[PDB]
Amino acid sequence: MLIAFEGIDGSGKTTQAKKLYEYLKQKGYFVSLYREPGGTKVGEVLREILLTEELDERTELLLFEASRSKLIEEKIIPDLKRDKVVILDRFVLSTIAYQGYGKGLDVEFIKNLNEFATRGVKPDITLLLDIPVDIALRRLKEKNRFENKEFLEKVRKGFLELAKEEENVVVIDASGEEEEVFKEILRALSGVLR
Amino acid sequence: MLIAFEGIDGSGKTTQAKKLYEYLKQKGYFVSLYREPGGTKVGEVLREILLTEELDERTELLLFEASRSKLIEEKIIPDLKRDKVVILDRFVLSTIAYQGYGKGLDVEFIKNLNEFATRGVKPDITLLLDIPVDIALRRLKEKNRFENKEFLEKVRKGFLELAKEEENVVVIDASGEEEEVFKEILRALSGVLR
Ligand SMILES: Nc1ncnc2c1ncn2[C@@H]1O[C@H](COP(=O)(O)OP(=O)(O)O)[C@@H](O)[C@H]1O
Ligand SMILES: Nc1ncnc2c1ncn2[C@@H]1O[C@H](COP(=O)(O)OP(=O)(O)O)[C@@H](O)[C@H]1O
Ligand SMILES: Cc1cn([C@H]2C[C@H](O)[C@@H](COP(=O)(O)O)O2)c(=O)[nH]c1=O
Ligand SMILES: Cc1cn([C@H]2C[C@H](O)[C@@H](COP(=O)(O)O)O2)c(=O)[nH]c1=O
Ligand SMILES: [F-]
Ligand SMILES: [F-]
Ligand SMILES: [F-]
Ligand SMILES: [Mg+2]
Numbered sequence A, B: 001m002l003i004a005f006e007g008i009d010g011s012g013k014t015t016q017a018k019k020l021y022e023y024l025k026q027k028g029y030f031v032s033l034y035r036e037p038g039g040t041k042v043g044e045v046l047r048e049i050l051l052t053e054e055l056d057e058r059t060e061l062l063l064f065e066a067s068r069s070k071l072i073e074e075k076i077i078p079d080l081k082r083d084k085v086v087i088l089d090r091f092v093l094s095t096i097a098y099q100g101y102g103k104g105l106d107v108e109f110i111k112n113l114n115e116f117a118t119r120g121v122k123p124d125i126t127l128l129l130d131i132p133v134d135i136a137l138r139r140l141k142e143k144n145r146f147e148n149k150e151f152l153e154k155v156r157k158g159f160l161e162l163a164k165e166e167e168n169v170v171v172i173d174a175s176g177e178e179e180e181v182f183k184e185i186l187r188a189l190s191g192v193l194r
Helices: A015-026 A041-051 A058-080 A090-101 A107-118 A133-142 A147-167 A177-189 B013-026 B041-052 B057-081 B091-101 B109-119 B133-142 B149-165 B178-190
Strands: A002-008 A029-036 A085-089 A124-128 A171-172 B002-006 B031-035 B085-087 B125-130 B169-173
Touching: A002 A015, A002 A090, A015 A029, A015 A085, A015 A124, A029 A058, A041 A058, A041 A107, A041 A171, A041 B013, A058 A090, A058 A107, A058 B109, A090 A107, A090 A147, A107 B057, A107 B109, A124 A147, A124 A177, A133 B169, A147 A171, A171 A177, A171 B091, A177 B085, B002 B013, B002 B169, B013 B031, B013 B091, B013 B125, B013 B178, B031 B057, B057 B085, B057 B091, B057 B109, B091 B109, B091 B149, B125 B178, B133 B149, B149 B169, B149 B178, B169 B178
Parallel strands: A002 A085, A002 A124, A029 A085, A124 A171, B002 B085, B002 B125, B031 B085, B125 B169
Antiparallel strands: none
């Protein structure tokens, strides 16, 4: 089965995704953890380009999808055939919220591309780690990570609208402490996974 | 002004596009010559991936389009704004013929990606260097290069259908000799540039 972590930078997705991965493996599930973009050899190359080069937003959209395509074909689709629990650090909702809201690209066009790159694979549940931008920015500032407050505020809202509109999204209060946020994720998952 | 060479591998695109580059430059035009994929730094990185790594067809489609977004916004749109003659070695018809007619992906979906990546920029004329696969393959083997007969036959017919179904496309008989082929190209150009 498939579990997506979503939300803005600094909401704790890397942290919780890895905590869920270890937790679920200890309980006997065969589990996978992938990040987006990245997660394959080609995908990580694309990731380094996305994070390093100066790119217009259209080329950006195409490479995020190129990473996703390779991840879906090479690892996700097989993993799910073997009944692995696949954990994603970001998925299709990140693209809509960042490139749609955020960058201003057409939401329906982004969706068509998501569907193309995913072959229509969708999560059993998406965990939206929602957090106020000013709090996420303080968290990132401690590791010397700077992100754009005006940009991330639009993006937070997009995630919230998507959580109302798309299926199987649970809003998590990510401003809590690491153990409380993880307990709230466990309750959210209790609906679909033992 | 925008001039695009299209056609199967080994049809003389590289050769004639450079012939035309030197020709127009001697006659006083400011000219650019770009290849697809490639033509920019990021575009050349993706070209080396597309050529050397084992990719599924969907990831391929997205990378070909990503290289094209980069070339359009970084170079072609500025070039055209300065009234440069831009000569492309492969453009949007190559994606339709290879990824659509060749590998079976949806041509309307491809044409939507084309439009998104080009921002609606279309050539003034496209030169299809039509040639029988057998000849092309022979020329290619002489330079120690081998391509897939069964695949190119589909791609050639795709190019010919687009020459009818698309706009501003002239079919060049590229089986002739180099000066013979360039002579039909100049003829085709004279209804566009002088
Ligand atoms: N619940 C939490 N409370 C406070 N800080 C946290 C919490 N979870 C993670 N962090 C810290 O916040 C920073 C960003 O978290 P990370 O998991 O990398 O977020 P994301 O992957 O969503 O950007 C890291 O330095 C991390 O140690
Ligand atoms: N008119 C021609 N007749 C015979 N051989 C040619 C002709 N034009 C080019 N060639 C040779 O065929 C090979 C492929 O040409 P090239 O322009 O690289 O084709 P493409 O770019 O379409 O792959 C090159 O080695 C070139 O020297
Ligand atoms: C997967 C994805 C990530 N991103 C952003 C999110 C991050 O700011 C950045 C790198 O992601 P990360 O910090 O979570 O690893 O790429 C998008 O804008 N669109 C997308 O589709
Ligand atoms: C521009 C483009 C090229 N190709 C193929 C054509 C070539 O076989 C291959 C390398 O290009 P080249 O031989 O013309 O240099 O990339 C596609 O499949 N789709 C595309 O959109
Ligand atoms: F993340
Ligand atoms: F990450
Ligand atoms: F991160
Ligand atoms: Mg991360």
